[PDB]
Tab-separated table of C-alpha atoms in Angstrom:
chain	number	residue	atom	x	y	z
Q	8	UNK	CA	0.880	1.570	-18.159
Q	9	UNK	CA	5.009	0.815	-18.830
Q	10	UNK	CA	7.948	2.587	-18.126
Q	11	UNK	CA	11.331	3.123	-19.627
Q	12	UNK	CA	14.383	4.910	-18.279
Q	13	UNK	CA	17.108	5.420	-20.668
Q	14	UNK	CA	20.517	5.708	-19.446
Q	15	UNK	CA	24.053	6.792	-20.414
Q	16	UNK	CA	27.381	7.916	-18.361
Q	17	UNK	CA	26.738	11.529	-18.527
Q	18	UNK	CA	22.972	11.882	-19.183
Q	19	UNK	CA	23.582	15.314	-21.328
Q	20	UNK	CA	24.097	13.600	-24.893
Q	21	UNK	CA	22.909	9.978	-25.499
Q	22	UNK	CA	20.065	9.260	-22.785
Q	23	UNK	CA	18.313	12.687	-23.270
Q	24	UNK	CA	18.291	11.960	-27.139
Q	25	UNK	CA	16.812	8.513	-26.826
Q	26	UNK	CA	14.375	10.119	-24.151
Q	27	UNK	CA	12.877	12.997	-26.245
Q	28	UNK	CA	12.580	10.693	-29.358
Q	29	UNK	CA	10.718	8.001	-27.644
Q	30	UNK	CA	8.409	10.457	-25.986
Q	31	UNK	CA	7.935	12.037	-29.710
Q	32	UNK	CA	7.072	8.707	-30.995
Q	33	UNK	CA	4.725	7.709	-28.332
Q	34	UNK	CA	2.874	11.036	-28.404
Q	35	UNK	CA	2.606	10.879	-32.124
Q	36	UNK	CA	0.842	7.376	-31.848
Q	37	UNK	CA	-1.379	8.866	-28.822
Q	38	UNK	CA	-0.411	6.265	-26.448
Q	39	UNK	CA	1.861	8.501	-24.249
Q	40	UNK	CA	-0.581	8.409	-21.294
Q	41	UNK	CA	0.312	4.737	-21.375
Q	42	UNK	CA	4.004	5.223	-20.678
Q	43	UNK	CA	6.314	7.049	-18.154
Q	44	UNK	CA	9.605	7.696	-19.570
Q	45	UNK	CA	12.647	9.258	-18.048
Q	46	UNK	CA	16.524	9.386	-18.429
Q	47	UNK	CA	19.105	9.180	-15.916
Q	48	UNK	CA	23.140	9.105	-15.528
Q	49	UNK	CA	25.230	6.563	-14.138
Q	50	UNK	CA	27.356	9.144	-12.795
Q	51	UNK	CA	26.532	12.461	-10.836
Q	52	UNK	CA	29.113	14.858	-12.583
Q	53	UNK	CA	26.388	16.831	-14.498
Q	54	UNK	CA	23.339	16.629	-12.267
Q	55	UNK	CA	20.990	19.726	-12.820
Q	56	UNK	CA	22.661	20.162	-16.295
Q	57	UNK	CA	20.177	20.603	-19.419
Q	58	UNK	CA	21.513	18.430	-22.186
Q	59	UNK	CA	24.786	19.249	-24.456
Q	60	UNK	CA	24.057	22.523	-26.651
Q	61	UNK	CA	25.112	19.538	-29.539
Q	62	UNK	CA	22.482	17.215	-28.526
Q	63	UNK	CA	19.792	20.106	-28.413
Q	64	UNK	CA	20.541	21.331	-31.811
Q	65	UNK	CA	20.528	17.665	-33.103
Q	66	UNK	CA	17.075	17.150	-31.649
Q	67	UNK	CA	15.882	20.793	-33.047
Q	68	UNK	CA	17.108	19.408	-36.247
Q	69	UNK	CA	14.464	16.942	-36.136
Q	70	UNK	CA	11.624	19.191	-34.647
Q	71	UNK	CA	12.052	17.820	-31.213
Q	72	UNK	CA	13.017	19.284	-28.002
Q	73	UNK	CA	13.192	18.420	-24.321
Q	74	UNK	CA	12.757	20.078	-20.915
Q	75	UNK	CA	15.314	17.275	-19.192
Q	76	UNK	CA	17.959	18.434	-16.742
Q	77	UNK	CA	20.242	15.481	-15.751
Q	78	UNK	CA	19.829	13.463	-12.620
Q	79	UNK	CA	21.715	10.090	-11.179
Q	80	UNK	CA	19.971	7.018	-11.466
Q	81	UNK	CA	18.770	5.585	-7.820
Q	82	UNK	CA	18.077	2.633	-6.183
Q	83	UNK	CA	14.567	3.374	-6.416
Q	84	UNK	CA	14.675	3.540	-10.267
Q	85	UNK	CA	15.381	-0.351	-10.358
Q	86	UNK	CA	12.579	-0.747	-8.529
Q	87	UNK	CA	10.233	1.276	-10.233
Q	88	UNK	CA	10.887	1.211	-14.243
Q	89	UNK	CA	10.113	-1.863	-16.496
Q	90	UNK	CA	13.128	-1.367	-18.562
Q	91	UNK	CA	16.551	0.382	-18.159
Q	92	UNK	CA	17.965	0.637	-21.695
Q	93	UNK	CA	21.460	1.608	-21.786
Q	94	UNK	CA	24.210	2.815	-24.582
Q	95	UNK	CA	27.272	0.940	-24.238
Q	96	UNK	CA	29.128	-1.853	-22.426
Q	97	UNK	CA	30.679	0.166	-19.771
Q	98	UNK	CA	27.063	1.401	-18.892
Q	99	UNK	CA	25.688	-2.046	-19.102
Q	100	UNK	CA	28.554	-3.352	-16.527
Q	101	UNK	CA	28.018	-0.311	-14.259
Q	102	UNK	CA	24.063	-0.842	-13.770
Q	103	UNK	CA	24.832	-4.454	-13.746
Q	104	UNK	CA	27.085	-3.793	-10.654
Q	105	UNK	CA	24.387	-1.365	-9.016
Q	106	UNK	CA	21.480	-3.798	-9.578
Q	107	UNK	CA	23.053	-6.343	-7.534
Q	108	UNK	CA	23.077	-3.994	-4.474
Q	109	UNK	CA	19.461	-3.359	-4.527
Q	110	UNK	CA	16.771	-5.292	-2.556
Q	111	UNK	CA	14.336	-5.482	-5.233
Q	112	UNK	CA	15.259	-5.038	-8.998
Q	113	UNK	CA	12.296	-4.852	-11.174
Q	114	UNK	CA	14.093	-3.410	-14.111
Q	115	UNK	CA	15.055	-5.272	-17.366
Q	116	UNK	CA	18.351	-3.832	-18.107
Q	117	UNK	CA	19.090	-3.904	-21.581
Q	118	UNK	CA	21.120	-2.108	-24.414
Q	119	UNK	CA	19.206	0.030	-26.141
Q	120	UNK	CA	21.224	-1.176	-29.457
Q	121	UNK	CA	19.825	-4.519	-28.977
Q	122	UNK	CA	16.781	-3.491	-30.477
Q	123	UNK	CA	18.597	-2.202	-33.749
Q	124	UNK	CA	17.114	-3.793	-36.695
Q	125	UNK	CA	20.539	-2.963	-38.415
Q	126	UNK	CA	22.437	-4.708	-35.382
Q	127	UNK	CA	24.675	-2.014	-34.340
Q	128	UNK	CA	24.561	-3.073	-30.538
Q	129	UNK	CA	26.522	0.030	-29.307
Q	130	UNK	CA	25.687	3.598	-29.115
Q	131	UNK	CA	28.995	5.324	-28.792
Q	132	UNK	CA	29.524	8.678	-26.629
Q	133	UNK	CA	29.329	11.744	-29.097
Q	134	UNK	CA	30.678	13.921	-26.546
Q	135	UNK	CA	34.183	14.508	-27.980
Q	136	UNK	CA	32.897	14.200	-31.557
Q	137	UNK	CA	31.232	16.658	-33.777
Q	138	UNK	CA	27.443	17.490	-35.104
Q	139	UNK	CA	27.932	14.404	-37.458
Q	140	UNK	CA	28.488	12.170	-34.507
Q	141	UNK	CA	25.530	13.455	-32.805
Q	142	UNK	CA	23.507	12.967	-35.913
Q	143	UNK	CA	24.794	9.259	-36.000
Q	144	UNK	CA	23.346	8.929	-32.513
Q	145	UNK	CA	20.135	10.268	-33.221
Q	146	UNK	CA	19.368	8.007	-36.086
Q	147	UNK	CA	20.560	4.724	-33.828
Q	148	UNK	CA	18.137	5.935	-31.129
Q	149	UNK	CA	15.289	6.687	-33.268
Q	150	UNK	CA	15.543	3.129	-35.122
Q	151	UNK	CA	16.130	1.488	-31.718
Q	152	UNK	CA	13.115	3.207	-29.929
Q	153	UNK	CA	10.908	2.450	-33.050
Q	154	UNK	CA	11.652	-0.963	-32.698
Q	155	UNK	CA	11.599	-1.156	-29.310
Q	156	UNK	CA	7.902	0.174	-29.512
Q	157	UNK	CA	7.000	-1.842	-32.181
Q	158	UNK	CA	8.269	-5.276	-30.668
Q	159	UNK	CA	6.234	-4.281	-27.411
Q	160	UNK	CA	3.066	-4.138	-29.546
């Protein structure tokens, strides 16, 4: 099996989208049993919240949905997941800090964007934007998740 944890600052816009998209992709390829997939936040501000309504609507526009509710990343996550894929530079620095504080860091911590064929390294926070900003994020997530999946296989 293989495990991937998607992470953003609040776990209500970007990482719930990446997670739903990745889950959709492995389900379509029938390999979903070989994957453990989750998402979480650097912060604890939104813990227990389902994703932003704009993220939910964005997903729904592509025939996708998620039962996720927000949680903070924990020490165990670093011990558990093979891959921790984050969205921007500040997430990456926060995760690199937290990883130095844990006994056993198994996870490879990477920008999701580093898998982008188009080389857009950063997936920016659409929270203060509109529906088009959510669509841009969705397209980045999709193409990165496709390349991540295809690189492994």
